[PDB]
Amino acid sequence: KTPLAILFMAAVVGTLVGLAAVAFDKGVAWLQNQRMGALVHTADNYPLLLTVAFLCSAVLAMFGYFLVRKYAPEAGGSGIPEIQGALEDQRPVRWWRVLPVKFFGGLGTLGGGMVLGRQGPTVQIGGNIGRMVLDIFRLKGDEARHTLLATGAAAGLAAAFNAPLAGILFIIEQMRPQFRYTLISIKAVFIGVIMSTIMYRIFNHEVALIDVGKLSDAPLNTLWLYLILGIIFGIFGPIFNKWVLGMQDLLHRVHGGNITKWVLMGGAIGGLCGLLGFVAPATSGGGFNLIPIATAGNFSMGMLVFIFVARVITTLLCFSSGAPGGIFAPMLALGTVLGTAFGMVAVELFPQYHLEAGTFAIAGMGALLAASIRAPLTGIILVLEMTDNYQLILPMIITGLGATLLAQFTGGKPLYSAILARTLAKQEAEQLARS
Amino acid sequence: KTPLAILFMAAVVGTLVGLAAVAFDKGVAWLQNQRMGALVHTADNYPLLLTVAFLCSAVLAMFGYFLVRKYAPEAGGSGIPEIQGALEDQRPVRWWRVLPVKFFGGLGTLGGGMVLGRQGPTVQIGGNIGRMVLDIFRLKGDEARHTLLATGAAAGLAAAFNAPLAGILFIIEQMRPQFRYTLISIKAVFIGVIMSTIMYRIFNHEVALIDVGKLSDAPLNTLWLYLILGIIFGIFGPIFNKWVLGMQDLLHRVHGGNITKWVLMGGAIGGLCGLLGFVAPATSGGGFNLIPIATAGNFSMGMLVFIFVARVITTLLCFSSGAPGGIFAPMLALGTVLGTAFGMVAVELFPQYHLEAGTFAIAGMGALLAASIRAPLTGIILVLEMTDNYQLILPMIITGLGATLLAQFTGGKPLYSAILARTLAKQEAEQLARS
Ligand SMILES: [Cl-]
Ligand SMILES: [Cl-]
Ligand SMILES: [Cl-]
Ligand SMILES: [Cl-]
Ligand SMILES: [Cl-]
Ligand SMILES: [Cl-]
């Protein structure tokens, strides 16, 4: 009866999520190209070019910050904490607000060149799309409601980075405590992921989404260095997480919850990233365009330290303000830069081992996700499906374990669970409306 | 306190399992080469060559069947149903019997050229190794006992086919209902898999374990054919499973549980496979040497039908008798042959689509595991780590879903769960010893 209705709806959800993820992607790419086109007007007067670049990114940012604070407060930030909450029945899915705001707000913020990524946006959009078709078709039952939320979210992740294996792992690993695993619920996840992936492939050439060439394999006597890399990320992960929650509390003292001040602060952050797009490209943007540049070895050791410091600052400023945008693609840039640096050192320390810094760059992306988000297998596979370097499978599991151990040992928690816990706590507290 | 003891013991288990898996592998390869060497004596008198080939495989088979029926009845068959049972507290782990019998019995049966594979042997050996070091070190606690069983089993699977990603998926997907997922229990699985994989790599060149070259990718307008392939395997999977349980009941009427008759029947089965090694190579052996031959397109359509029929017969005869040996590698051969046949038809039916039979061969391996064993993600990844054809990720998820749907719809169950259910049922029944 209703089990076959669920499996057919999953296919509908997967197709619609897929087209939304491609629209979001193509929309953000067009806006960035439109900005570079409107600045050809001031081709050889650099002062005025930087000034209108600033105001152009400030307006789009202010547009996004406005939509979130006015129509959908829960569309601020990543999206994953909110979906995670909804899979527990702890949070609503207001798709009539979150789909228009997250889409058109995320176009303004990522489109302006802010230090934000697509994962959280499209995963939340996918989940709301999943709830939308449930509410449109009037499917009744607690299983259907929960199941289509899950297939919508997985489909969002798979369509965003062309990563179907990762979209399934996002539900069976990262959302293990929330997800009610049944025979029908897991087939629906597969169907939604299959359909959303086909929609990506119709519009994009199937390739390495992060073209980093084909690196060398990792020899046996080399493998221990990936455990040391993992340990380093293990201690750094929980510190970074303390900084993104701290920076939410600190940036709140600026505006005090007031819409006008909040939007103006977003315009400054948005404007600044739009400026830094031009004067120092590697310090700004989501992170994708600089990962292959860094992994190839084009930066000096001193330059990698500068990008790392600058990026941690612009990453925290963008994400913690509560702009609609994810921290996934920023974190990949941070792990690439720190991993390449680690790689450079090891190359000079051990001339015997026949090493290459780029293998440690790719391990670094997996390591930072493992240490902060604490869903290792999902991050490791995500990075492999985007780089297509499947011979680094063992190195990355070793780095992921390193990161996972020391992150638990040094008192870290999963970033997304921590943010949801603060949202739930703050909501309980504001039942002082109840005296 | 005890959490750090568990993570250090996992490393010990992973190393020991790794060396046992390599020893088993190298032992089985040496015996097969020793048999081909002792038959050079009768190089140009073919009648006597086949006769001693028969008696040579019959003795080794009789040796294996003897060890199982005399010292460790639960070492007969795969191993996975028994481990699965132990993870539920429903079955004992008699490592003082199962390690010597499974190892030296599995050397005689797989070494004689019987239609049996290494997965079940090494997974059960790994689990017993995990319980052995728990009992040696006298670790107390229900968590430790359960956890090291799990890391031992995963490590066995990862070391047997050089498949670390698959060894983790074997516990988080295939053993989901049994496995008590905690922060410490999952890190221990990782550690055991890391260490066992290193032990494989020390003794074997890291390559494609099934060298099948680099096939073409799957174009978009082609993807629907993999769903039809999946559907076909979906209906065939539960039928095959009915035949392996049926063939256990039928082959039991031969000996009636009597040790003498049982061993003699094993010698006939063992002898026959040793003969068929020489007169018709593709009808016998575990399956690994004929998968690349079939995938390359060297067999005519008529020959693929003959191998399929012959193999289903020799696969059921070998496995269902209760010889120590797995059905995993046999099933891969069956899915390769049926998939190549399907591939050939589609190539001629659609000259427009620019297809290759070999893509459907690899999809077929995933499809038969999905339809019988019913752990799709684990099988699909296993096949990718052995063939190294990571561009067929989406085709295989589509075939796995096809297979998983129709196998549930047509009333199939997971092979391993079905065998364990019959073992538990038969044990309850023989408490008629209680009047
Ligand atoms: Cl957030
Ligand atoms: Cl993101
Ligand atoms: Cl995110
Ligand atoms: Cl069995
Ligand atoms: Cl096997
Ligand atoms: Cl098996």
Numbering used by the authors:
A (entry chain A), B (entry chain A): 30 to 464
The publication says:
CLC transporter proteins are present in intracellular compartments throughout our bodies – in our hearts, brains, kidneys, livers, muscles, and guts – where they catalyze coupled exchange of chloride (Cl–) for protons (H+). CLC-ec1 is a prokaryotic homolog that has served as a paradigm for the family. Like all CLC proteins, CLC-ec1 is a homodimer in which each subunit contains an independent anion-permeation pathway. Gluex is positioned at the extracellular entryway to the Cl–-permeation pathway, where it acts both as a ‘gate’ for the transport of Cl– and as a participant in the transport of H+.
